């Protein structure tokens, strides 16, 4: 059964945010333990082209088979679906890297979304991976956040529909029901809320077993999240699931990793700042125990 990591890496554009330690965190992630010994790895918010390609190099040796970053352009992909626009500044932020060859790779930009908050190519990335003769499927995505700017309740509704976009793709792609379909990423639905049950339905997946930390976005123990929202509530937002109509792994587990790198710092205007996290999200590992 596969071993995967999923990680929202907070690699914002160095043009709009020149001092968030983008390049250095790309090196720190490359050197972390959690990033090692997995089959597949999903990234989100690898927005800054330069820092994203560095992070991809840093893992090219253990994970040679890679997809481009969602929404950057139309080349390098077997197909391109949904509302792909080539005018938009920021791209999708999603990419996948695999220890085993990628037989097919497809990008899809969500058709459901918000008109004002942000011109983005958010969506999902599909990959068909060959392992031990057998075929295995992995989708990485990053849905509408609560940091909305859109109406009250609209983000939840947007997500609902963005997820329906994924399951329908799975459905009509017609994948051998004896082949496992992993769907993971920053899903932006908090655990233990009524929306959580909706997510299971809309994505078409069963819940999994949990290990390690009880949140993935934590202003209470994560130095970066603490700076952005010092009074924000800890939430569990990153998940890796499987399609409930395809092969189930033995006993799928999500482990929230809280590994911290050696502290890194930076100078902004007159001030000096220290941090010791890879991102404002914690990475999650997934495996069949």
Give contact residues for Ca ion (rule: CB under 5 A).
145
Query: Is 45 labelled as part of a ligand binding site?
Result: yes
Measured at CB, which residue is nearest to Cl ion? 19
- Strands 134-142 and 123-131, how do they pair? antiparallel
Least CB distance from residue 160 to Cl ion, whole Å? 33
**Phi then psi dihedrals of residue 240, to 5 deg:** -125, 120
| Residue (17 or 196) nearer to Cl ion, CB | 17
| Residue (155 or 243) nearer to Ca ion, CB | 155
Least CB distance from residue 16 to Cl ion, whole Å? 8
Least CB distance from residue 152 to Cl ion, whole Å? 30
d(CA 275, CA 281): 13
**CA atoms within 13 A of residue 157's CA, in its CB half-sphere:** 6
Least CB distance from residue 188 to Ca ion, whole Å? 6
Closest CA to 23 of 49, 60, 43, 45: 49
85 binds, among Cl ion, Ca ion, none (CB under 5 to 8 A by kind): none
| Residue (203 or 224) nearer to Ca ion, CB | 224
Least CB distance from residue 32 to Cl ion, whole Å? 21
90, 13 Cβ separation under 8 angstroms: yes
19 binds, among Cl ion, Ca ion, none (CB under 5 to 8 A by kind): Cl ion
138, 182 Cβ separation under 8 angstroms: yes
d(CA 148, CA 142): 14
264 binds, among Cl ion, Ca ion, none (CB under 5 to 8 A by kind): none
145 binds, among Ca ion, Cl ion, none (CB under 5 to 8 A by kind): Ca ion
| Residue (193 or 227) nearer to Cl ion, CB | 227
* Number of other residues whose CB lies within 10 A of the CB of residue 106: 18
List all residues 6 or more positions away from 252 whose beta carbon is below 8 Å from its beta carbon.
208, 209, 240, 241, 242, 286, 287, 288
17 binds, among Ca ion, Cl ion, none (CB under 5 to 8 A by kind): Cl ion
| Residue (24 or 99) nearer to Cl ion, CB | 24
Cα-based torsion angle of the residue sequence 65, 256, 216, 166 in order, rounded to the nearest 10 degrees: 50
d(CA 63, CA 75): 20
**Residues 15-74 contacting Cl ion, CB under 5 A:** 17, 19
Contact residues toward Cl ion (CB under 5 A) are 17, 19
Annotated binding-site residues read 45
Binding-site residues for Mg(2+): 45
Task: Please state the residue numbers annotated as binding site for Ca(2+).
Answer: 45
């Amino acid at each position: 059964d596969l071993k995967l990591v999923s990680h929202n890496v907070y690699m914002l554009s160095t043009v709009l945010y020149p001092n968030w330690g983008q390049y250095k965190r790309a090196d720190l992630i490359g050197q972390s333990s959690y990033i090692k010994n997995n089959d597949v790895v999903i990234f989100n918010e690898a927005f800054d082209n330069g820092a994203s390609d560095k992070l991809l190099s840093n893992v090219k040796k253990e994970y040679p088979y890679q997809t481009p970053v969602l929404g950057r352009s139309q080349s390098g992909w077997d197909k391109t679906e949904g509302s792909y626009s080539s005018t938009v500044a920021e791209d999708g932020g999603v990419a996948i890297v695999s220890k085993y060859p990628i037989k097919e790779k497809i990008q899809h930009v969500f058709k459901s979304g918000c008109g004002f908050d942000n011109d983005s190519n958010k969506g999902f990335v599909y990959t068909k991976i060959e392992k031990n003769g057998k075929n295995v499927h992995v989708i990485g995505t990053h849905t509408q956040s609560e940091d909305s700017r859109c109406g009250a309740g609209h983000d939840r509704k947007i997500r609902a529909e963005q997820m329906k976009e994924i399951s329908d793709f799975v459905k009509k792609k017609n994948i051998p029901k004896d082949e496992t379909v992993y769907i993971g990423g920053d899903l932006n639905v908090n655990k233990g809320t009524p929306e959580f049950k909706d997510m299971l339905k809309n994505l078409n997946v069963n819940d999994v077993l949990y290990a390690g930390h009880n949140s993935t976005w934590d202003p209470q123990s994560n130095s970066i999240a603490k700076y952005n929202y010092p009074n924000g509530k800890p939430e569990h937002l990153d998940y890796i699931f499987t399609d409930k109509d395809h092969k189930q792994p033995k006993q799928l587990v999500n482990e929230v990793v809280t590994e911290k790198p050696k502290p890194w710092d930076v100078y902004a205007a007159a001030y000096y700042y220290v941090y010791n996290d890879f991102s404002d999200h914690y990475p999650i590992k997934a495996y069949s125990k």
